[PDB]
Every structure is written in structure tokens, then in C-alpha cells.
From a paper:
The redox-responding transcription factor PpsR (photopigment suppression) from Rhodobacter sphaeroides is such a multi-PAS domain-containing protein. PpsR possesses three PAS domains (designated N-domain, PAS1 and PAS2) and a highly conserved glutamine-rich linker (Q-linker) as well as a C-terminal helix–turn–helix (HTH) DNA-binding motif. PpsR acts as a repressor of photosynthesis and tetrapyrrole-biosynthesis gene expression by binding to palindromic DNA sequences (TGTc-N10-gACA) present in the promoter region of PpsR-regulated genes. Additionally, the function of PpsR is regulated in a blue-light- and oxygen-dependent manner by the antirepressor AppA that, together with PpsR and its cognate DNA, is able to form a light-sensitive ternary AppA–PpsR2–DNA complex.
We finally extended the phases to 1.65 Å resolution using a native data set and refined a high-resolution structure for this variant. The PpsRQ-PAS1 structure revealed a typical PAS fold consisting of a five-stranded antiparallel β-sheet flanked by several helices. In addition to the PAS1 core, part of the Q-­linker adopts an α-helical conformation corresponding to a PAS N-cap. This is important for dimer formation as observed for other N-cap-containing PAS domains. The main dimerization interface is formed by the N-cap, its connecting loop to the PAS core (residues 156–161) and β51. The N-cap further contributes to PpsRQ-PAS1 dimer formation by protecting hydrophobic patches on the PAS core of the symmetry-related molecule, as also reported for a subset of other PAS proteins. The 20 N-­terminal residues are disordered and could not be modelled into the electron-density map. The remaining ordered part of the Q-linker region (residues 143–157) forms a helical element that corresponds to a classical PAS N-cap. As proposed previously, the N-domain also significantly contributes to PpsR oligomer formation and/or integrity, most likely by stabilizing the extended Q-linker helix as shown by the disordered N-terminal Q-linker part of the PpsRQ-PAS1 structure. In contrast to the other studied PpsR variants, PpsRQ-PAS1 exists predominantly as a monomer at the concentrations used in this experiment.
Author numbering:
A (entry chain A), B (entry chain A): 143 to 257
């Protein structure tokens, strides 16, 4: 059940063509992502896991960026933040949604190209 | 951990814009899906959960259809089956991938419009 649902989660995230990054509300760090997100961000999973999400985006810092996404996720309008990914040099639209798991909050962020 | 990973799975599947249906290899029935899949199939989650996947598609039967998807998933080429969804009357492309969880196999099927 632990491993069962873990396995379902892993496969659905990996197979999904929707570019997604999962971010810790506590630390602002990337806790998971899929390869579609990796492609838009310009990095492999191994480089992005554990990385501060704000530092992937030019001119952003953890405090303000996490506050921005937290506030946007509260509008429940799928409102996006416009960003520029340092590695890929692609302008992107990031749409955050907050949910609770294991006593903490995570932000599931969808990524789309902006241009 | 059971609930934690279950919660992650639920949210990722629901939020993902990639239309996905999860099918039991054992029964050929739909065990899960997201609303993007529901839209293409022409049914709500409540009508589709527990339904035989083959019976959603005109002219298909469980035996041959499950054998078709199982064989296609083995080619590892993302080869699609062309189908016509009874409820929505949309021609679709279904791409199956097989994985193991909790001692059984599931097919995670991506759905795309065909026309």
C-alpha cells in the first residue's frame, strides 16, 4: 500500500506529458518533477532534485517567489507566473496549486512555454 | 506514507492535463482516470470507474482488446490503438504502458484525439 501507491505515483508523474514540478512549501526546494518539466527548465532530474525552485528563474529569490506562488495558488484561477529558466533560456508560465501530504504542504507546478 | 504517497498520486493524476486511464490487467476494468480522459471518452469519473475499458470503444471486446494493448505495450514504441469512444463519439488514439503494483499489473493508457 505504501509501495503500491508510491509506484502508481511515480509512473503517473513520469509518463504524464504535462510538465510538472513538485516543490516543498517548507524549503522551497524541488522534491520531484518529470522529464517534460526537465526539458522546459533545461535540466535533468538529477540536477533539479533538491534545487531551490526560485534559483532556476532569472531574478527570483526564494522568499518573494514562494510568497508569489502561494498567493497565486489561493486565487484558484490557474493564474501563472511569468519566468525565464536559467538553464534553457526559455520563457515559461508556471501555475502553482497547493496541497497537503504528510503534515506538510507541497506546490504542484504546471509549466508551459510562454512564447 | 500510505496516505502520503496516495495523496501525491491522486493530485498528480487529477491535475495532469495528459488524459490518462488506469486499467486492471486482471479484470480489464477502469480502476482510475482523470477528467481530461473523461472529457475525451464522454463520461464522468463516476460512470467510468469499474467499467470494462473495451466496452467504451465501438466494436471492441475485452479479450482481444486487452491482448491488443498488452502486445502494443510490449513494443515500447508508444504505438497507439485507434478507437471510437461510444459516449463522446470521438475517434481516439490510446497508448498503453504496463507496470506492476501490489502483485498485479496495471495499464496506464494515454488518450489523444485522432482527428
Amino acid at each position: 500500500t505504501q509501495r503500491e501507491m508510491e509506484t502508481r505515483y511515480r509512473v503517473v508523474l513520469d509518463v504524464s506529458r504535462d510538465p510538472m514540478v513538485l516543490v516543498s512549501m517548507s524549503t522551497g526546494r524541488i522534491v520531484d518533477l518529470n522529464s517534460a518539466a526537465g526539458l522546459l527548465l533545461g535540466g535533468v532530474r538529477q540536477d533539479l532534485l533538491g534545487a531551490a525552485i526560485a534559483q532556476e528563474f532569472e531574478g527570483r529569490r526564494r522568499g518573494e517567489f514562494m510568497e508569489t506562488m502561494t498567493n497565486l495558488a489561493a486565487t484558484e484561477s490557474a493564474a501563472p507566473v511569468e519566468v525565464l529558466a536559467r538553464r534553457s533560456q526559455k520563457r515559461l508560465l508556471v501555475v502553482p496549486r497547493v496541497f497537503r501530504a504528510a503534515g506538510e504542504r507541497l506546490l504542484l507546478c504546471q509549466i508551459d512555454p510562454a512564447d
